[PDB]
Design a protein around this nucleic acid. Structure first.
Lengths: 58, 76
RNA sequence: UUUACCAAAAACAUCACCUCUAGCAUUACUAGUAUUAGAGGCAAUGCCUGCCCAGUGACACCAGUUUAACGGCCGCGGUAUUCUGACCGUGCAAAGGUAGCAUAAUCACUUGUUCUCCAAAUAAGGACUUGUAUGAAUGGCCACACGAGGGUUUUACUGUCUCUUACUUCCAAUCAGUGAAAUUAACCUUCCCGUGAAGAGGCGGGAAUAAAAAAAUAAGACGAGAAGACCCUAUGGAGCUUUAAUUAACUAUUCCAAAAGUUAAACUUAACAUGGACUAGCAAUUUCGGUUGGGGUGACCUCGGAGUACAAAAAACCCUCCGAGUGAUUUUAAUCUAGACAAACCAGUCAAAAUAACCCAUCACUUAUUGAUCCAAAAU
RNA sequence: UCGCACACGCUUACAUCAGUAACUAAUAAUAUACUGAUAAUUAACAACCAAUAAACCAAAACAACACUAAAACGUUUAUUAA
RNA sequence: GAUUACCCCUUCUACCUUUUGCAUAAUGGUUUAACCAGAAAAAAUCUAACAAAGAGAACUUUAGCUAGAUACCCCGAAACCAGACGAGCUACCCAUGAGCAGUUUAAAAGAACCAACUCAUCUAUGUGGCAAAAUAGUGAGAAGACUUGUAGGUAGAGGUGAAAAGCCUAACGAGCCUGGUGAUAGCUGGUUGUCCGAGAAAGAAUUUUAGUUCAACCUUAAAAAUACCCCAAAAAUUCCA
RNA sequence: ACCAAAGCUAGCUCAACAUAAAUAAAAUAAAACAUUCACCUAACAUUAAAGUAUAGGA
């Protein structure tokens, strides 16, 4: 629910005026974790905020 | 090209709506006029626009009097 | 060198001059480095390029600097035969055209005046300067050579001309072979004087006339050919330009976040990439009234009164006179029942009478003096 | 008078025989450019082929040379392999 | 119509469209054949079913309800958007080759003239042509910023352009093809058999004048009224015997 | 009687059944135009709710 989200943009956020479609893409950063089951260090470029949920999923 | 300027005014249709001998009703407009061309007589009321009307049911009659007035009467 | 296919020219390019921006790296610039690269103007060369930074732009930061940045560089009065004004006084401005040039690719008046050229010169050349409306890097003034550029005068030679004539060849002409085209409502298709939407072979009245071709002349059939390229109309289209209004994408910023450090018992830092609003330079969508003796310009657009509009209404013109988007003084217009005027729609006037409680009016001649929807607010 | 060869191309037009009322080359003659059938020259001509790694400075203009604009194509050595 | 088994004489200003008005020298048509442009029922009028109910489990209803039958045609842009095709034409550039006699001359791929080649100055001819860019005479460059072959690159919310609003496959103020698309057109050009009755040329408004919305009229089918020409009582008329 | 018409047959339409990546627009309607626009790209059966509740330069 992040990658490739294309919405619409307005000026005063109340529109009697023009509406122009705007593109939105998620932020990408590197997250290094360690899997003991697979015995492998993993690198995830995935969603930042999701990692905050993963930390609560442990 | 024209320096002078003026507008046109729609008519308010001033005049006498009813005639002598006609059978009218109470509250009916008799004569719409500017200022006083004629004066209200018996059983005839006067308006703010100086328009005479009939007070009661009857017949319209015009009568001239000189003491120079013109009265309109309504005879039940 | 340039509008291939109406413009080859003074235009563009060109050596050269000047201003100004770039101290930086591995698929432009450039495998370059201030003597290099990008941008702008001018255009060999020769002599020069004076003044003004108040506004705009630009650079250092709110103040100043900057003209080979965008640009700008005056008027009036008085003074010696005539005339003129070296000089003086004064208003204004940021500062008021210096050298040179000039009826000019510039001069309206204009065919300025004078001189040269010609038997005659609105052109041309050489001067004068009250330069409507030249001017110094959108450079100024000259300049050898150069030019299928733009003008003027003598000589030479010519069918250009006075003034045309003759000849040759290819067509035109004839015959034979092959056999088009646009155009075309149907055509028995004369002329004159009149009329007819005002330019008649078809109408009227007069005149003229047996019926059909070929070689020629281009007046008419408002000939043929292009749904005028001028004008105006359409709530047509498109290109271009902006301080028209309204604002996503790209190039550079201000803050808070992501990511890192610091103290005490709440604060400071940005290498790469990515966000939320935000400030500038760039870009993105459309609009562009009507009336109108064509349009544009000018004027006008709603309302009230007095004429045009002679004894109830109403009645136009870019006809004609005046008035308004209110001004002020005192009492105050509380609830609703008939019934009418005017009226396309919608907006405007009069009002008996009943009830509750008391017991609208004057001026601006009398009337004018405003605004129908949806949406906001002092609060209902 | 101005044309024969090499091409990129152009897909039997061409050569022989036979027949041309008709179409085809604006007609006839006929035919290299019509129909029908049947012939269509090679090669030492032109296309198609070694992998790499080293050596070397001082352009071309019938060029010792010189100039500028700073220089189409060139050779040699060694290894593997057909 | 007469007239003779034919003709002269007399009687008559094509059709259509558009208009205040056209035989009009306003519009469209060579002729013929064929093709070719009024398909929508809510409320209503009308024919039938039943009736305080109709109608095939859905709605209406102080005579309704249900069913059937009656009125609103085509062609045409200039342009916009999307996806692609185009630099064998032409513009520029990259890579690789080739071409440009002769004469005067001091060393001079140096200057000037002049053939090829590259251009198109002037004149004439050609004007459904030889040719949708020509031919003849003449003229420019012709060692240069030159010409040219082959192999490549750059395209339309652009490229290129010694910069003309030029070129990008014979018409570029922004190519062409396909699709959106039967875009939009208040405009203009069009809309076909008979007979009968009646029969319109201007009130105010409108980002409106070449268009619309109700009045001023008109037509169909029914009902209830009355209406006008209108003299003296009275205010050219306004009213009424 | 001349160019000529006139004499048939292939052929199909439709209904039913069987079987190396990334939000498209705009013209247009609101007689201009700018918020807005059934519709179209893929999934979307009948009767009625209902052209109702609402939304819209209301």
């Amino acid at each position: 629910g992040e990658g490739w989200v294309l919405g619409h943009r307005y000026v005063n956020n109340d529109k009697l005026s023009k509406r122009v479609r705007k593109v939105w893409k998620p932020q990408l950063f590197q997250r290094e974790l360690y899997s003991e089951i697979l015995d492998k260090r993993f690198t995830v470029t995935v969603t930042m905020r999701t990692l905050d949920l993963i930390d609560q999923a442990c | 090209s024209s320096k002078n300027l003026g507008g046109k005014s729609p008519g308010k249709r001033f005049g006498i709506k009813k005639m002598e001998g006609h059978y009218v009703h109470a509250g009916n407009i008799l004569a719409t006029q500017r200022h006083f061309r004629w004066h209200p007589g018996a059983h005839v009321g006067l308006g703010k626009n100086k328009c005479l009307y009939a007070l009661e049911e009857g017949v319209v009659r015009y009568t001239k009097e000189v003491y120079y007035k013109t009265f309109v009467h309504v005879v039940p």
